[PDB]
Amino acid sequence: QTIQPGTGYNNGYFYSYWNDGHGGVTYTNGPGGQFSVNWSNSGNFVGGKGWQPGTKNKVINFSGSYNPNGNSYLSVYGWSRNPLIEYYIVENFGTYNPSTGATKLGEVTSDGSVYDIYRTQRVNQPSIIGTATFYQYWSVRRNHRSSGSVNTANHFNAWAQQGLTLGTMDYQIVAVEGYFSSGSASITVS
Numbered sequence: 001q002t003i004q005p006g007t008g009y010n011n012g013y014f015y016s017y018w019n020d021g022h023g024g025v026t027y028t029n030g031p032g033g034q035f036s037v038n039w040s041n042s043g044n045f046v047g048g049k050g051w052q053p054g055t056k057n058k059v060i061n062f063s064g065s066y067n068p069n070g071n072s073y074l075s076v077y078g079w080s081r082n083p084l085i086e087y088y089i090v091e092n093f094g095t096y097n098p099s100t101g102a103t104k105l106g107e108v109t110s111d112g113s114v115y116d117i118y119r120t121q122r123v124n125q126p127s128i129i130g131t132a133t134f135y136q137y138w139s140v141r142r143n144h145r146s147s148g149s150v151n152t153a154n155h156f157n158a159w160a161q162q163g164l165t166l167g168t169m170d171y172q173i174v175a176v177e178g179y180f181s182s183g184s185a186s187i188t189v190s
Contacts (some may be wrong), residue, residue, distance in 0.1 A: 002028040007052075007171075013189060014052035014171055025178065033189035034064070040182040046077070046175050049189045054078050054172020056156050061190045062174045063147035068094035070181025076150050078172035084127060084134040085166060089115070089155050092144040095179065099140045108158035110151055113143040117162060123135035128170055137164060146187075 007016045010029040017027045022043020028036045035049045051058070066074045076089040090098055102118035109123045110160055111113070118138040139155045158164055 002026060005033065009052075011047070013049040014173065014177075015047075015049045016171060016173060017045075017047040022180075024182075030186075030188075034186065035189075036184075036186045037082060037176050037178075038184045039178050042178050042180060043175075044179050046177045046180050048077065048173040048175030048187070050076075050078075050171065050173030050175075052119075052171040054169045055152075056166060056169060057153040058172065060152060060172075060174060062091075062150070062187055064185065064187035066092055066146040066176070066185045066187065068178075068181065068183040068185075070072045070094055070183065071096045071179040072181055073098050073177045074146065074187070075175055075177070076152065076172065077175040077177070079128050079170040080086065080166040080168035081129065081170055083165065084121070084129060084132055085137055085164065086127065086134060087137040087139075087159075089139045089141075089150055089152065091141050091148070091150070092146055093140075094183070096179070097140065099138050102136075102138060105162040106158070108139065108154060110139075110154035110158075111149055113141050113145075115139040115141050115155070115158075117158060119162075119164075136166075137162060
């Protein structure tokens, strides 16, 4: 169903939908691991389905239509505690590369493409544990796609070789994020 921001479980999967209050975004939970998002002149939002808690070796499958009209990303997104980390394994994006301004740590090959790895620090920003300071890890896919399989272990292992050591995994979802743009997406996670 079309819902206001919140989290929960729907048809077997965890979901999380958040927006900045700006308006212009419609999020709908669909059958199985499907979710749909339609936006027009939105603010900043994030919505998707997956698991709570996630794991360090989950192989995530996703398929569907992803049609961004401007700034947006389609990624495997989640958090870790001890250390507190917000991470993204970006599979596709619109007009803006999300790693812009981040520090490149290295590269990793996974699921048919090389990914560039970055890190950035968020100081006194909102998090799953409240206002805090933490790193944001990024794996950005070179060959954009809207369907496929993501072997999270390859990314976590690559990040570990670069110094990151994830601790307790919190939620882990396939998410569509939008940043003051428009677009449509219908994604199914499994």
